[PDB]
Structures are given as structure tokens and as C-alpha cells.
Amino acid sequence: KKKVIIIGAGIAGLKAASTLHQNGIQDCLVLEARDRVGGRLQTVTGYQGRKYDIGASWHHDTLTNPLFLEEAQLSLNDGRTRFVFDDDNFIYIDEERGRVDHDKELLLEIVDNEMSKFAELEFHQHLGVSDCSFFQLVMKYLLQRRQFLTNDQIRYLPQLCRYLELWHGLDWKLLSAKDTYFGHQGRNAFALNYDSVVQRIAQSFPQNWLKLSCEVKSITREPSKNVTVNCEDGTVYNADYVIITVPQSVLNLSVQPEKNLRGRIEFQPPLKPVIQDAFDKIHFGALGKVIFEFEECCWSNESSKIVTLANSTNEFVEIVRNAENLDELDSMLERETSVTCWSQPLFFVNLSKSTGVASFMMLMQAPLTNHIESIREDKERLFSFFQPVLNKIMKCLDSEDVIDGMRPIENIANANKPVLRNIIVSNWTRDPYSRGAYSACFPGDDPVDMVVAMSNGQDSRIRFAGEHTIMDGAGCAYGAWESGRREATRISDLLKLEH
Amino acid sequence: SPAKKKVIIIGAGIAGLKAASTLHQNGIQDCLVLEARDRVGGRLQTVTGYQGRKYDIGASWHHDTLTNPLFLEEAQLSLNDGRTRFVFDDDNFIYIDEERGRVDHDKELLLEIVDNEMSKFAELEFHQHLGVSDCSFFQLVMKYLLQRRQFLTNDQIRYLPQLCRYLELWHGLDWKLLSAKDTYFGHQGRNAFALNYDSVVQRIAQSFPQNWLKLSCEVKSITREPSKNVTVNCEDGTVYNADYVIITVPQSVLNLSVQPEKNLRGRIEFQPPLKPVIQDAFDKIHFGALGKVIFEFEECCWSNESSKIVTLANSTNEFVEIVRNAENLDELDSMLERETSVTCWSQPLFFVNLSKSTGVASFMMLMQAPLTNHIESIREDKERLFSFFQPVLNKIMKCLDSEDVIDGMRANKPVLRNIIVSNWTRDPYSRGAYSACFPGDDPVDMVVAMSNGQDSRIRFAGEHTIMDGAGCAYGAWESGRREATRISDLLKLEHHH
Numbered sequence A: 001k002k003k004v005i006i007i008g009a010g011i012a013g014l015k016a017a018s019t020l021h022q023n024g025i026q027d028c029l030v031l032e033a034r035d036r037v038g039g040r041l042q043t044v045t046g047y048q049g050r051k052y053d054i055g056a057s058w059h060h061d062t063l064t065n066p067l068f069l070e071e072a073q074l075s076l077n078d079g080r081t082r083f084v085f086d087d088d089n090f091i092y093i094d095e096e097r098g099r100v101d102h103d104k105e106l107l108l109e110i111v112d113n114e115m116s117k118f119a120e121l122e123f124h125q126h127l128g129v130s131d132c133s134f135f136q137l138v139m140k141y142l143l144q145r146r147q148f149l150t151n152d153q154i155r156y157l158p159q160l161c162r163y164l165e166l167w168h169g170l171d172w173k174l175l176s177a178k179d180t181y182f183g184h185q186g187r188n189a190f191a192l193n194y195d196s197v198v199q200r201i202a203q204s205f206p207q208n209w210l211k212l213s214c215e216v217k218s219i220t221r222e223p224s225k226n227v228t229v230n231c232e233d234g235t236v237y238n239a240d241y242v243i244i245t246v247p248q249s250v251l252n253l254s255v256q257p258e259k260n261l262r263g264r265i266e267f268q269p270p271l272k273p274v275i276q277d278a279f280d281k282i283h284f285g286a287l288g289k290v291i292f293e294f295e296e297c298c299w300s301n302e303s304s305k306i307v308t309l310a311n312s313t314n315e316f317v318e319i320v321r322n323a324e325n326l327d328e329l330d331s332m333l334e335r336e337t338s339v340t341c342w343s344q345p346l347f348f349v350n351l352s353k354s355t356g357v358a359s360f361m362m363l364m365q366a367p368l369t370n371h372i373e374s375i376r377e378d379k380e381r382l383f384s385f386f387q388p389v390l391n392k393i394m395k396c397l398d399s400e401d402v403i404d405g406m407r408p409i410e411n412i413a414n415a416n417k418p419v420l421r422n423i424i425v426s427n428w429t430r431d432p433y434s435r436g437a438y439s440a441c442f443p444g445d446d447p448v449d450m451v452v453a454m455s456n457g458q459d460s461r462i463r464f465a466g467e468h469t470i471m472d473g474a475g476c477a478y479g480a481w482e483s484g485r486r487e488a489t490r491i492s493d494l495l496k497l498e499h
Numbered sequence B: 001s002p003a004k005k006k007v008i009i010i011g012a013g014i015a016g017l018k019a020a021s022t023l024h025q026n027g028i029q030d031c032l033v034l035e036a037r038d039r040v041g042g043r044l045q046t047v048t049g050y051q052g053r054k055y056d057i058g059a060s061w062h063h064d065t066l067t068n069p070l071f072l073e074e075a076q077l078s079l080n081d082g083r084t085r086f087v088f089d090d091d092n093f094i095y096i097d098e099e100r101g102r103v104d105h106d107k108e109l110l111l112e113i114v115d116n117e118m119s120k121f122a123e124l125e126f127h128q129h130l131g132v133s134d135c136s137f138f139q140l141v142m143k144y145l146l147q148r149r150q151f152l153t154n155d156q157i158r159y160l161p162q163l164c165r166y167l168e169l170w171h172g173l174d175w176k177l178l179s180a181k182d183t184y185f186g187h188q189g190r191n192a193f194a195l196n197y198d199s200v201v202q203r204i205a206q207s208f209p210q211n212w213l214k215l216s217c218e219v220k221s222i223t224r225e226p227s228k229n230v231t232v233n234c235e236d237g238t239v240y241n242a243d244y245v246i247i248t249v250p251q252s253v254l255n256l257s258v259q260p261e262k263n264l265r266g267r268i269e270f271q272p273p274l275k276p277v278i279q280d281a282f283d284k285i286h287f288g289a290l291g292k293v294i295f296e297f298e299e300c301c302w303s304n305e306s307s308k309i310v311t312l313a314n315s316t317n318e319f320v321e322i323v324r325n326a327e328n329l330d331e332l333d334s335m336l337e338r339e340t341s342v343t344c345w346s347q348p349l350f351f352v353n354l355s356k357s358t359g360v361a362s363f364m365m366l367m368q369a370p371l372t373n374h375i376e377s378i379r380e381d382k383e384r385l386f387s388f389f390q391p392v393l394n395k396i397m398k399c400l401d402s403e404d405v406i407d408g409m410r411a412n413k414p415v416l417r418n419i420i421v422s423n424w425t426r427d428p429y430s431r432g433a434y435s436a437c438f439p440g441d442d443p444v445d446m447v448v449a450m451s452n453g454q455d456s457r458i459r460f461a462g463e464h465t466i467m468d469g470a471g472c473a474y475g476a477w478e479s480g481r482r483e484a485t486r487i488s489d490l491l492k493l494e495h496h497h
């Protein structure tokens, strides 16, 4: 009855479909569990109608990102804005000391660079001589190079370098050291509407192709040579080809028994071992988001990128100065609670200087993300939690403490005072259709495995797509977009040839 | 009757000194170190100036501190005795344009950020690719500007290419003379400034029998007596015969060998002549001309925000319009042509503010070629030098919250007491600064021919004979350790039964 049945209406599946029509293939079905398209790409509205990409926001690797280039052409053709380069010089803030960026004495950015070169060398040509956690690596650097670091450097550098937790979505004691430093292939470009990207691709194919709210319960390719998909309601389908674009964490449920978990798909026969094994090489991180909407900017627009550093101590310097080796340092680093906004690094994007809107887009990581999303409905508790860092930022930006107007009450006094009006929070960790953010490595992992296995497919008519199925752009929106075009073209060439 | 020696080392630079240090360490005796000059050290020379202040007119920094073996030693000695031997003086660079003033970390130009994209762009252009034409660095920057003009503001397309050029001071070559493939390279760690590079030379020099050192003997010829004996002739007539010889003369000096006319200072006549593999490598590698000029002042009366300052060359608004209207590659290569002398603003200059880093009231400035050759050819005229550099000197002081300088060579303003200049392009024993690449060059050729040797007895060492640390002090040092270890390995066989 059907040529190709794409499961999932995320950018991956959507591009796939988009491509199939663009190639004259017809009778295709797009089955999506949610009541919307866009997958991990969702734009939401808040105060006064403002819009934000609570999911993906940036176009990365702009020098080689195909999707970006495409958006570039369009914009070059009709003078319509679609993005803005928001990269800037980072302002780093330590609760007690204030700004620590571009400091004439600390030179944190400079030693941070040495630190990364230190990493590269540690894992170069050695098969990766036993990989450890990002935290472990950082401790080695300090120990080995202590003779060439001041006290403050040993103290503040380790906290500053942790901004990388916001790229992976994992705490430095849970992140693989070997996969921490990536290749920054160019400047980043803030997408003024990833939804526009989603709608354009979405419209590009026959609308009667989309089937929202069709959670797929099980896939089975009868040796008869065709695939049989069954949604959760009962409606059955049969197709020549099928492209599973569900996220990795969800597909990881297929290997567990007692499959009843929302989203889980039952394959038959099961997934070949090369696939099941891939999951032991870990994966899935938890980057989260929190939006702070204000009445109107009343703070310095010096930079669009701000990072708050976790607290640090002087006893730490001393401990590093006295340790006689890694072992001693380890055990010595044993001090005996409760998490606060200064327990981990936090990344704020000042949307004022980059888009004009008086709002801060913040990024958080595991384990904090999971916790903050659990209390997303409790605005009060959310305010109390972030207030202390929200005030520190305003101070270092020539302003004053933040006023809680989430339960508005007009008052002139709030002339040039910052007034919070709304707070928005992601929920990717508690949404059974995503269960996290995107692929990520724990120490001892190897991403190549999944990429290969996925890209090989279960067999001939069963293929996979999405950010966890490709190398270039791994974990990214453009990575997924290309994995979708990958399966469509391959099948497109086959159909065109069969007759 | 010509004296017998086990090993004769020609040249007393850090390479040869280390070669000898190693021989003695491995127990070899009856050796010799012959040097043309009347001092040891070579391109590691420390001079004295106003009020007895000191400066390294040759090498100044230990590079790649994370792996630099020579740097690690000095670090061990300080760790066990508390004596200051070096200092980490890296910093936040201050960039200055004559018209616009400081353009570093400017919230709208964001120059450093696009420079990183530039380098990444270059990396994707070459790194790991096969059969890619080379072209000059200048051309690479023109290509980047073309392919990304849609994502660069007008003012960015103007100033970014001028900031890019700080690299000219690492290679000692102007951007149109520089190989683009060899322009970008990896920096393994921070740089540590030597507080007495001549202090490193002596330690190594005092680690072997002092009767070995023969200064002021220039070697005129080296001959292999087909019987495992090498003859060496000093100009003063002494004749020596030894089993092995480590030749460490500069690559620019050894090049003189592949030419007729032996009355040139430094030239060594080889018999038989250097194998064709060696003469031919001279066509695939060249020599740069980094240079220095020290400006000494009475006292510091300027800001010590940073110790690294770079002044950009003038840029125009027409360049922009051309970049915007450019059609393709050739169209730009064409349009770029107009119709004029050279001044201090005709090329980027790199100033080191010693007052912050060492506490001395002076600037150490680095220059590239062609400027270095012209500036060293007038080093004797201090008045002319002061004029030439006065405008940038003023601009700097202005930006560092001070005022125009006062020629005091012959109380709230900066007074210039003395100027010191390099002499490498003119000294017949240097003939330049160090090995560098021209577009289309292949340094690997020289290293291979060099480290392989003339034959089993006639060996080579020096900054141009090794891959890791090429052109650097630690590269020459290691190259010395290498040739000596090999010889030690071979004489060791004399004790077997």
C-alpha cells in the first residue's frame, strides 16, 4: 500500500519525506507520535508573544553546515533575515570575585588553551591509552604543570574550563575526556526561527502524508519481502521501505524486555547484535533550557555570552601544592551538601544584544537539568533558585537586583530596575518521546559504533536516521537533516531504477 | 703529523655545544669544538646596552613548553635551586590601527573571533588533503574573504586581513613571500621568556673539557680520506684528522658550498662534494629574516595592561568595495592593482613591553622581511632609525595613556635613551635568521638529506636538520644530542670481545 513509511516527523524524517517528493515518489506516510511536527525542534511563545527555540537554537559549523548554506542561499535571494551570528567575547563571573575574563593577571583563557593542547597530546597516537573523565584529565594537568601556575590560576581555571559541560550536556565527572574537545568548524549562527526551517520543509511535501498521533508499537518485516508497521490504535500498514528516525534513547528501549514503556517499538526479528552492542558504548546527555523574560532591557549589552563559574576554594590550591601524586591528590580531594545555582557552571545568552528581546536564554546540564525540569510548574521555587546568580549578572552588567513580577503589580519605582515577568523551562528529560537531549559519551565509550551500525541499517528496507546515526554533525540538527536526505536519496535511486 | 681526534664539531652554537656535552657524558675523549667567532652561542647572543641592561638579540623564548626538552631541564634546575631562569609572558594582544586606534576585543569588529574562523578555514583548505596547490599566505586570506563575504561586515573585511599578519613575525617573512601551507602550525603550550639565554649557553659549555674549545678557528675545508679518516683544515693552517665530524653551520652558510669561489667567510670546501640529494634540497627550502630593535627609555611612564602589542599596516575602504564587487578569484586578483614608499605603517610590527614582564623600561620589537634587511642596513644611523619609527612609537604611547616620545639619545614624558639593532642579515656567519618556507617549498627534503648525512663520518646538526622544533633553539639542541648519540653508539663497539 505504501512506498516509504517514515517514522517520526522531526527534521530527519521531514527532510527524508521532502526529498522523496522532490524525486517524484508517491504514496508515502509520515507517522508521528506527538500532535505536532518538529521533534526536538520546537518554538514556543511566552510573554507579549515572544518566541524561543526551547530546543535547538544554533546553526553550528557554518563553514561546512549544508542546512545553514541552504538557509544562506534563500536569504541571499530575498533579503529576508533567517539568522544572526551571535558569537562574542565571553564574560565569566565568579560569585565572590566578579568578572574574571580577559584579566591582566589571571589570563585564564590563555592557560585554558594550553589545557586543551595538553588533552590532545594525552590521547594522541596511543589508542587512547585508557580514557578517563574530563574531571580526571583536568586534575592531571594541574598536578603536572603546577610549577607554572599561580595560586588563582590553579583555583579559577578548573571552574572556567567547565563551560564545555554546556556543549555536551554532562557534568565534568560524568563526561568522557577523550570526546570532550571537538572541532569548532567555524562561527555559530543563531536561527531566527528553527520553526521556519521546520514549516518550509514540512510544506514541501503532500500534506495528506502526515499522520499525527500514530505512536508505532511494533515493526515487522515478513520474509515475504515487505514491511508491516502497526500504530498504537490498531491501523496497520505495509510498505516497500521504512525509515526509523526515533531518538537513540527511545530505540534503546527495544533491547529491554517487558517492553511496555511509552514510545518503545517491537522489532521482529529483533535488532542484530551489532546494533544491541552499540548501546553498551553509552550515549545520551541532558542539556536543558530555562528562559527569563523581562519587561525591557536595562543592563549592559557588552556581550551576548555569559557564564557563571561554580564556587571554588583556596584550600584547593594548597591541596594541589602539596599532593605528591595522582593517588594522594585523589584521596586528599575528599571533603564532606545541597545543590544551588553556584554548584555548577551556567551559560546565559543575553538575547538583548543579539535579537533585541529582553530575555536571557540559559543552558544547564545533568544532573541539574533533570532536577530543574521536575519543578518546571513551580515558578516561585524556580525564582528562588536562580535569583542569586540572576542578581550577580545584573551587577556585573551595571544594573541592580532583579524584581519578581511574575505575579505583576504595576509600580513606577521599577524605573530602571530589571523586572522578571515569566519563566519557561524545557522538559526533554521527562518527555517519553525524547528522554534527554542528544547523543553523548561517558568515559569508555566509542560513538563510531552506533554511527556505523545505524548507517548500515537493520537490512535492506529498514534504515535509520537522526543525529545519532551520522559522523559529520553528530548530535546536531544539520547532522540529522543530512541523515534524512541520506536514506531518501538511497531509496529514491532504487525506486527510479526498479523500472 | 696532524693531530688525531675522535670527533670534531664545527661551530659552537647550541647544537654543537650540546653535541659535545653529550659526547663527554658518554665518556668519549679527545674531541674538539671549532668556532669561527670569538664567542660561543651563535644565534643565542646576549648584548648589553643603556645602564648595563641586558637583551637577547637572537633567540628570546622557549617555545612549546609542554614538550620542549631543553625547557624541561632549565625547569628542573630552578625547581631544585630556586633561581629564576625564565618567565611566562604570554598575554592579551593589543592591536592598533593608525586612524582607528585600538581595535582589539572591540565589541563590534570581533576581529579575534573571525581570525579563528580564518585559521580553521585554512586548516580545512590543507590539513589532510592530497594534491592541493600551495599559493602564498596573502592569497589564502584573499580567498577566505571571497568565500565568506556574505558573513563579514564591511569593517571586518577591511581590518581582519591586517590582523592576520601577526604571523609574519613567527616566520620572519612578509605575507606575499610566505608559504600558506606552512603558515599555520601547532603551539604545544605557552611560551616562556628566557631571562638570560646566554645563561643556558654557558651551563652547556662548561659541561665538557674546556681544552676542547677552540674559538676563532674558521674551518675552510673538510675532506674524506677514503680509509675512515676525515681531514679538517682551519684557516690559521692547523690540520686535524678525526674519525667523525658534526657540521653545524647555518643552512645559509652551508649553501655556499654548492657554489664555486671559496674565498667567502664561512664557506667549507667539501671533497668529495656534497651529494646531489643535498645540493638539490636547497631549491626546496629558504631562509627568513626575523629581526629585532630595542628601544631603551629612562623610566616607565606608560600603561602595563599587557606585554604584547601589535601595530597593523594601513588599510583602505577601496579594498572593501573591491571585495564586494569582485566577480570571482581572477577578477579580484585583477582589480587589486593600483598606482608609494615604505614607512612604519607599511607592515605589521610586534612590540614586547618589557616593563610589565621584566620590569625594565624598554620595548623589544620584532620585524620581518623585507623590512629587516633594509632596517639592518642602516642600523648605524640612530637618528634615521628614530625618525622612521617615531609615528608608531607615538601612537603606542597615546594608546597606553602617555605622550609623544622625546629623543634623548644625545619629567612626565617618555625619553628614548638608546636604540639597539640586530645584525643577522649582515654577519657572514648567520646570513639571515633561520630556515623558512616559500610557497611551493618542501622542508621535509632538507631534513631528510641533512639527518641522513654526507656519508657515515660526515654528519649535520642545527635548526634546519630536524622536524620537531624546526627553526627553534630546542630543535637545534636535540639535533645535536642526536648526532652525538649515534657516534657514541658506534664507538661503543670497540669494547666488545
Ligand SMILES: Cc1cc2nc3c(=O)[nH]c(=O)nc-3n(C[C@H](O)[C@H](O)[C@H](O)COP(=O)(O)OP(=O)(O)OC[C@H]3O[C@@H](n4cnc5c(N)ncnc54)[C@H](O)[C@@H]3O)c2cc1C
Binding pocket: A007, A008, A009, A010, A011, A012, A013, A031, A032, A033, A034, A037, A038, A039, A040, A041, A054, A055, A056, A057, A058, A059, A060, A214, A215, A216, A217, A245, A246, A247, A250, A263, A264, A265, A287, A288, A289, A426, A428, A433, A434, A436, A437, A438, A465, A466, A467, A468, A475, A476, A477, A478, A480
Ligand atoms: C535543549 C536542546 C538544545 C539543542 N540545541 C542545538 C543547537 O543549538 N544546534 C544543533 O545543531 N542541535 C541542537 N540540539 C540537537 C538537535 O535538536 C537534534 O540533533 C535533532 O533535532 C534530532 O533530530 P531527529 O530528527 O533525529 O529527532 P526529533 O526529536 O529530533 O525526534 C525523532 C521523532 O521521533 C518521534 N517518535 C519517537 N518515538 C516514536 C514512536 N514510537 N512512534 C512514532 N514517532 C515516534 C518523535 O516524537 C520525534 O518527532 C539541541 C537539543 C536539545 C534537546
Ligand SMILES: Cc1cc2nc3c(=O)[nH]c(=O)nc-3n(C[C@H](O)[C@H](O)[C@H](O)COP(=O)(O)OP(=O)(O)OC[C@H]3O[C@@H](n4cnc5c(N)ncnc54)[C@H](O)[C@@H]3O)c2cc1C
Binding pocket: B010, B011, B012, B013, B014, B015, B016, B034, B035, B036, B037, B040, B041, B042, B043, B044, B057, B058, B059, B060, B061, B062, B063, B217, B218, B219, B220, B248, B249, B250, B253, B265, B266, B267, B268, B290, B291, B292, B422, B424, B429, B432, B433, B434, B461, B462, B463, B464, B471, B472, B473, B474, B476
Ligand atoms: C632574530 C632571531 C630571533 C630568534 N628567536 C627565537 C626564539 O624566540 N625561540 C627559539 O626557539 N628560537 C629563536 N631563534 C632561532 C634560534 O636562535 C636558532 O634555531 C638556533 O640558534 C640555531 O642553532 P645552531 O646551533 O644550529 O646554529 P648557531 O648560529 O645558531 O650557528 C652554528 C655556529 O656555526 C658557526 N660557524 C659558521 N660557519 C663556520 C665556519 N666556517 N667555521 C667554524 N664555525 C662556523 C657560527 O659562528 C655559529 O656559532 C631566533 C633566531 C633569530 C635570528
Ligand SMILES: NCCCCCCCCN
Binding pocket: A163, A166, A167, A168, A347, A363, A438, A474, A475, A476, A477
Ligand atoms: N556555550 C553554548 C554551547 C551550546 C552547545 C550546543 C550543542 C548542540 C549539540 N547538538
Ligand SMILES: NCCCCCCCCN
Binding pocket: B166, B169, B170, B171, B308, B310, B350, B471, B472
Ligand atoms: N606576536 C608575535 C610573537 C612572535 C614570536 C615569534 C618567535 C619566533 C621564534 N623563531
